[PDB]
């Protein structure tokens with residue numbers, strides 16, 4: 001019952017476009033009586049063989065995850081012979097946390113941000129117990145099920161660690177979200193639980209800027225290295241900036257202990273970054289104090 005027939009997927013709209021993939025809102029309505037449920041359908045935008053094998057691995061990863069803060073796998077659809085493989089997931093109605101936060105910023109306070117932050121930590125820790133490296137954590141990948149629950153919502157870049165190493169080396173061709181990447185990911189293409197923690201620090205920054213426009217990591221980092229650079233030079237300068245302990249600023253209104261969580265996630269020393277369990281503990285302690 002995790003096999004969807006393509007003929008019954010009714011396209012409703014395009015939700016998002018990304019890592020060689022696209023996500024659409026559809027209605028699965030096999031009875032053709034308009035009682036089927038609305039689902040999210042992910043497909044490749046250009047189905048090469050390398051992208052198909054990556055997509056199949058991403059599907060297997062998501063099917064292996066069951067957690068309150070991980071988007072639910074529903075099934076696959078490939079009635080177009082081999083190709084046009086599509087991943088069926090639950091549809092979350094409030095969209096990405098990036099959009100949601102931006103749209104409701106005047107009625108989401110810091111205790112609510114910390115609720116979201118803690119759920120993100122629990123999701124990421126579960127990923128780590130499976131030895132999965134997410135790589136692409138960002139508020140655009142975090143989805144809002146309702147006002148009290150968010151979920152990690154996309155796994156297109158997630159890799160499994162080798163059984164004998166604590167990192168995974170990978171250089172994907174294309175534009176990489178460098179303003180969320182740990183320094184050792186920029187210099188050595190090394191991804192680990194610790195670089196996921198660096199990126200989680202960027203997600204926390206994102207949350208506390210409420211997705212204010214000029215305050216995004218790309219905007220702040222390009223302001224710090226100078227908007228006069230272009231091309232590969234950008235990466236180079238970013239690397240230098242991070243190696244001289246250049247960092248994203250404290251967002252307006254962010255308390256010092258929250259910014260300190262951020263700065264501890266952004267340690268150049270990979271082994272000195274906190275664990276996700278410790279991140280959840282600290283966030284939950286602060287949230288309790290605020291109440």
Ligand SMILES: Cc1cnc(Nc2ccc(C3CCN(C)CC3)c(F)c2)nc1Nc1ccc2c(c1)N(S(=O)(=O)C(C)(C)C)CC2
Nearest residue numbers: 015016017018019023040089090091092095096140141154
């Ligand atoms: C699996 C899933 C489940 N439910 C939802 N619901 C949902 C509902 C509404 C909106 C918007 C649409 C219009 N605006 C105005 C209002 C709400 C929405 F965007 C999503 N979306 C999902 N995936 C999903 C969708 C879109 C994007 C995703 C991921 N990313 S992404 O992960 O980075 C990437 C690129 C796929 C790699 C970034 C964009």
